[PDB]
Amino acid sequence: RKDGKPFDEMDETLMESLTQFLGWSVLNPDTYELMNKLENRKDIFQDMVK
């Protein structure tokens, strides 16, 4: 820390809230993979009927 003093309660809560938000926000990267698989599977099955 940039003041020379150790971390305490009021600097634990802040960085705990930050990591809680970052942990909740992992929903988006999974849906990216699900989209990039659904699109390819649709393309394969639409090229099978041609």
Binding site: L18, F21, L22, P29, T31, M35
Partner: peptide, 14 residues
């Protein structure tokens, strides 16, 4: 920090 991080996590899927 919550407001500014919410600005950048809703911009695009990646």
């Amino acid at each position: 920090i919550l407001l500014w991080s919410g600005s950048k996590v809703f911009e695009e899927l990646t």
